[PDB]
From a paper:
In CSA-DIC, a significant change in the conformation of the loop (500–508) surrounding the FA5 pocket is observed. The ligand molecule in the CSA-DIC complex creates the highest number of interactions. It is slightly shifted towards Ser488, making a polar interaction between its carboxyl group and hydroxyl group of Ser488 possible. As a result of its deeper location in this site, the ligand interacts almost with all the side chains of polar residues that are present in the pocket, but it loses the Cl2 chlorine contact with the main chain of Ile387. In the DIC2 binding pocket in the CSA-DIC complex, the change of Met547 side chain conformation increases the space where a ligand is bound. In the CSA-DIC structure, the carboxyl group of DIC2 is rotated toward the side chain of E548 and makes additional interactions with the oxygen atom of peptide bond of K544 and nitrogen atom of E548. The DIC5 of caprine albumin is anchored deeper in the FA6 pocket, whereas in the ovine albumin it sticks outside. In the CSA-DIC complex, the DIC6 molecule is localized in a unique place, inside the IIIb subdomain, covering the FA5 binding pocket. Diclofenac is bound in a loose and partially open pocket. The carboxyl group of DIC6 creates hydrogen bonds with the main chain nitrogen and OG1 oxygen of Thr507.
Serum albumin (SA) is the most significant transport protein of vertebrates; it constitutes up to 60% of all plasma proteins. SA consists of three loose domains, that are almost structurally identical and mostly helical. The whole structure is maintained by 17 disulfide bridges, which ensure durability of the overall protein fold and simultaneously allow its flexibility. In this paper, we present crystal structures of three animal serum albumin complexes: ovine, caprine, and leporine, with diclofenac, a popular non-steroidal anti-inflammatory drug that is used in therapy of chronic and acute pain.
Author numbering: 1 to 583
């Protein structure tokens, strides 16, 4: 809800620590290249202004919107001109256009330095000033992930500070904290990906897509709840995500906290797993709620055919109350299959909807849609062979070889895409093998659909930033939930025109020899992509031959006395072997 003085309302509701953290995340995400200390100064200003309005809400400016107050502060910054180019034209503008402009310049691949944990340095900053150290975490993560779910980031900052509580007085510091940080990293990065999808769903596919996703998710977590209660939570959760995805972080966090309280107050009718969550403080409580994945299927439920195929009013309901009805389908399907991937459940609803659009026009609709559930069950099973084949490949060759097989597959599909993006995405796809292939047989498909949804959304976000392939555009935009089928269906892109081999220009040198081992692995994956960009029709056996040659040449020359000399002499020999091989 809104108050006359929104700044006072949210300061009152959130309290000063969380208010400050949230405002710092806002500024970090709007202005990702700006330094920490400049952000801190604006947050302090606004905080101090907040306190003025709490004490006297009649004070000048206290009835301004949050965007006005945020924006005026962003426009103090002189360097907006230098550091952002045509974004200081946001500052030239006034609200509500200004805020929109700022939002549009969030950068999904800002290319800041890779963060590296240095235990002694970190421990000393923690000692010096814990609050600054917390703030610095919020800043560094937020600016790398400009749609990170902001109240979840506050929870993670508290966990981060806890790692250093534990480890800094420990004798051996890095032994204690490096693995903690590694673990936290993978969890934060997963969280950012799941939120980036949520935000894509609303931004690119509309509020109705986000509602659809929410009804499916919530029905797997709280399947014993009634539809009217699930739908209440959907309405609230949808408002929360809309706010967070739009950069309305103070409202997001406040509404989130209210929704956590509602959930906990109604825990007996929603899920027994809430018992672990509901006596925690707000941020941890909310995180715990988010972490719940599923409950048991309620006993004694009727077949879905009753409401969705037998009922004489199926067409009526589809026609007159379409959103409610598709919502009910989602709730009822989801609650019966709480282990399914959400994207699959949505894929089913979409086909159900398509079935009704075709059949409800006919003289005997029921004749036409009576068997729709059998078609849906088949749709669930469609990719089981290929998933099995993928997991068999992973088992036979391991993660790095599985990534290599994916580089080939994906480069053929989308050869226009940049080499760093093809490598990033293919390595992430290969990690799906490790995360999913030793799940129970029956849990593999939902595992792989879930991660694929996240990884392909990353692809699509990177592609939006600089579009290069009509086929990737098409798959990214045709339908959010059928992205995985779309991309799987793509074949070699014959639209692509390869540039010739720069046959006189040989491009590899002895500085490869000193790389850390994982960087040596990436260098070989980069080489593979480039080989495919020059000879996009090469066979698997050809690419293997050439890559084998390449790695023997690198090993031979990195072990030589004169290393660069070997690269220079034998490099031309490599190009010759390669040519003969790619005929
Ligand atoms: O304010 C303090 O006492 C500690 C401190 C030191 C350096 C930088 C920031 C902060 N605190 C702080 C932070 Cl970490 C973020 C936003 C607003 C404030 Cl006041
Ligand atoms: O490592 C990342 O890419 C982000 C990330 C997520 C969770 C925890 C830490 C980090 N990065 C990071 C590192 Cl590597 C060191 C010190 C402080 C930070 Cl925020
Ligand atoms: O729209 C809302 O705020 C919640 C609501 C309540 C009852 C029925 C449908 C909906 N929303 C909704 C919509 Cl608009 C589309 C697909 C799935 C759902 Cl749950
Ligand atoms: O791509 C396919 O045809 C099979 C398929 C279906 C559902 C989910 C994932 C996958 N494939 C797949 C798998 Cl199983 C793991 C890692 C990367 C990919 Cl592309
Ligand atoms: O030498 C280069 O990097 C460019 C070039 C020119 C002619 C023939 C092949 C290549 N590159 C090349 C070779 Cl020779 C082997 C494996 C991977 C690559 Cl990218
Ligand atoms: O030398 C080899 O053949 C192993 C190798 C090294 C670097 C890059 C790729 C490959 N192998 C390879 C190739 Cl070229 C394609 C698909 C799957 C695999 Cl394992
Ligand atoms: Cl949440």
């Amino acid at each position: 809800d809104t108050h006359k003085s929104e700044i006072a309302h949210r300061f009152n509701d959130l309290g000063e620590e969380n208010f400050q953290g949230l405002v710092l995340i806002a500024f970090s995400q709007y202005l990702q290249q700006c330094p920490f200390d400049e952000h801190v100064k604006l947050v302090k200003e606004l905080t101090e202004f907040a306190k003025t309005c709490v004490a006297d809400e009649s004070h000048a400016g206290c009835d301004k919107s949050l965007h006005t107050l945020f924006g005026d502060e962003l426009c103090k910054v002189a360097t907006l001109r230098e550091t952002y180019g045509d974004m200081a034209d946001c500052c030239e503008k006034q609200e509500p256009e200004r805020n929109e402009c700022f939002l549009k310049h969030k950068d999904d691949s800002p290319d800041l330095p890779k963060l590296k944990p240095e235990p002694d340095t970190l421990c000393a900053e923690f000692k010096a000033d814990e609050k600054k150290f917390w703030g610095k975490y919020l800043y560094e993560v937020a600016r790398r992930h400009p749609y990170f779910y902001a109240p979840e980031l506050l929870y993670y900052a508290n966990k981060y500070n806890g790692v250093f509580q534990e480890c800094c007085q420990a004798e051996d510091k890095g032994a204690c904290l490096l693995p903690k940080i590694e673990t936290m990293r993978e969890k934060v990065l997963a969280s950012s990906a799941r939120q980036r999808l949520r935000c894509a769903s609303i931004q690119k596919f509309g509020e109705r897509a986000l509602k659809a996703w929410s009804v499916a998710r919530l029905s797997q977590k709280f399947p014993k709840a009634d539809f009217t209660d699930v739908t209440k939570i959907v309405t609230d959760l949808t408002k929360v995500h809309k706010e967070c995805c739009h950069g309305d972080l103070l409202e997001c966090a406040d509404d989130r906290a209210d929704l956590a309280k509602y959930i906990c107050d109604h825990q007996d009718t929603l899920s027994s797993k809430l018992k672990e969550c509901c006596d925690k403080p707000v941020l941890e409580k909310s995180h715990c709620i988010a972490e719940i994945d599923k409950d048991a299927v309620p006993e004694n439920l009727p077949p879905l055919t009753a409401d969705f195929a037998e009922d004489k009013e199926v067409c009526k309901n589809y026609q007159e109350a379409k959103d409610v009805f598709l919502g009910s389908f989602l709730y009822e399907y989801s609650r019966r299959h709480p282990e399914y991937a959400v994207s699959v459940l949505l894929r089913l609803a979409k086909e159900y909807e398509a079935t009704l659009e075709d059949c409800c026009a006919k003289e005997d609709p029921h004749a036409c849609y009576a068997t729709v559930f059998d078609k849906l069950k088949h749709l669930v099973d469609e990719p089981q062979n290929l998933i099995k084949k993928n997991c068999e490949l992973f088992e036979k060759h391991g993660e790095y070889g599985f990534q290599n097989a994916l580089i080939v597959r994906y480069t053929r599909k989308a050869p226009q895409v940049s080499t760093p993006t093809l490598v990033e995405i293919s390595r992430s796809l290969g990690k799906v093998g490790t995360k999913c292939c030793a799940k129970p047989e029956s849990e593999r498909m939902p595992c792989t659909e879930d991660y694929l949804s996240l990884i392909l959304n990353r692809l699509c976000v990177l592609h939006e930033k600089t579009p290069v392939s009509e086929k990737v555009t098409k798959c990214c935009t045709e339908s959010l939930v059928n992205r995985r089928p779309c991309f799987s269906d793509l074949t070699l892109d014959e639209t692509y025109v390869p540039k010739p081999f720069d046959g006189e220009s040989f491009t590899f040198h002895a500085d490869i020899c000193t790389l850390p081992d994982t960087e040596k692995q990436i260098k070989k994956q980069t080489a593979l992509v480039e080989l495919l960009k020059h000879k996009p029709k090469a066979t698997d056996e050809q690419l293997k031959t050439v890559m084998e040659n390449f790695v023997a040449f690198v090993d031979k020359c990195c072990a030589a006395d004169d290393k660069e000399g070997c690269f220079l002499l034998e490099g031309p020999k490599l190009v010759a072997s390669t040519q003969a091989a790619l005929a």
